[PDB]
Amino acid sequence: VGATLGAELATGLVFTGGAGADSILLGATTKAIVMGAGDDTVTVSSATLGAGGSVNGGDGTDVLVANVNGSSFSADPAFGGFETLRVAGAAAQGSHNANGFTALQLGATAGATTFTNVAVNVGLTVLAAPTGTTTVTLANATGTSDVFNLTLSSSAALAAGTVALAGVETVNIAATDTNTTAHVDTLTLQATSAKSIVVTGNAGL
Amino acid sequence: VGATLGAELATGLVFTGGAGADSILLGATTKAIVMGAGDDTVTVSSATLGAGGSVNGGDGTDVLVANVNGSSFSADPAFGGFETLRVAGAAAQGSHNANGFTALQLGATAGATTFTNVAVNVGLTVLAAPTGTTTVTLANATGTSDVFNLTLSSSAALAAGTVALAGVETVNIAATDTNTTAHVDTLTLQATSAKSIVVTGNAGL
């Protein structure tokens, strides 16, 4: 099933995952971290690693969590095998390069956070109340049939805050409740060229 | 065989290559440039494109020439299908992200130029005298069996200048003459952990 360690590993410390959702916190690591198969999750406290100093998500859909002031994980060959970029943590903030990720997530944050170079058919899922305006800017917004999939996904009432979607024509919102007891989510949308808004889900908005 | 256009295209202007080595100069392009098959070459005058605003090298081994103050082409999804990164031009200079390229080239430059995040088995070929110290820093220099392949390749005597290869243990230099008439190349190497230097080729060093 996997193992999760809530404490940030030593910069000197090697970690090896297996099948199943393993989950750790890394700092400026000096060692070659492997995550194995299954849907894994590494949270980084610093954007670039050290010495050398790598982390491979391995097979499966793996989440990389940026607890940092900006990221560009696609550029760094130190990170590989990740599919989802989540911006969440007490230091999580600022401009984040979405390039090369197939999904996006957002949690509690230190301040306003921006996703750049977001490819087509890439959706954002918000999982907890962030701080400050969340801007999404697509790889190419210029067309007139631009579709974005926003998801809100929580057990309790979620105050998603402001998300800005400049140049998107159809905005799809899923409001998702993870438990059996009903709630109502809240969102400021700023989508000045949206012609359609479609809401799906099983919670209020 | 291909076509080559030495003038920089209009930012509004669409270009389509075929098979064979086509070759152009781009600025902050607004359009979707395709290069087709064969070994193509785009020179860019500005690091990020515009509007949107893309250039795909297509099939084959294609060169991207950075006539700019720094690059990170791997990060930008606007560029794709390139295999070789060359730093050459009257504005070419500064820090350049080698990530995702399988070969490197260097020509005449505006000033000191640095290749970062250079993967293993990636070699540099210098084609003309650059300006200022050329630093190569590898993706991972930390091991004790590090091999780098430097090539010097010119018709006439080539003053390669200073190249710095911190953390490389075996430095291989090819000194290559492209014509039948003999010459002697010059190089300052700064390789403070090299145990071996091997020189091959058909010109003097």
Ligand SMILES: [Ca+2]
């Ligand atoms: Ca695993």
Ligand SMILES: [Ca+2]
């Ligand atoms: Ca995995």
Ligand SMILES: [Ca+2]
């Ligand atoms: Ca994977």
Ligand SMILES: [Ca+2]
């Ligand atoms: Ca990556």
Ligand SMILES: [Ca+2]
């Ligand atoms: Ca609920």
Ligand SMILES: [Ca+2]
């Ligand atoms: Ca649009």
Ligand SMILES: [Ca+2]
């Ligand atoms: Ca819009």
Ligand SMILES: [Ca+2]
């Ligand atoms: Ca071509």
Ligand SMILES: [Ca+2]
């Ligand atoms: Ca090509």
Ligand SMILES: [Ca+2]
């Ligand atoms: Ca590329």
Ligand SMILES: [Ca+2]
């Ligand atoms: Ca190609």
Ligand SMILES: [Ca+2]
């Ligand atoms: Ca000669």
Ligand SMILES: [Ca+2]
């Ligand atoms: Ca070394």
Ligand SMILES: [Ca+2]
């Ligand atoms: Ca050395």
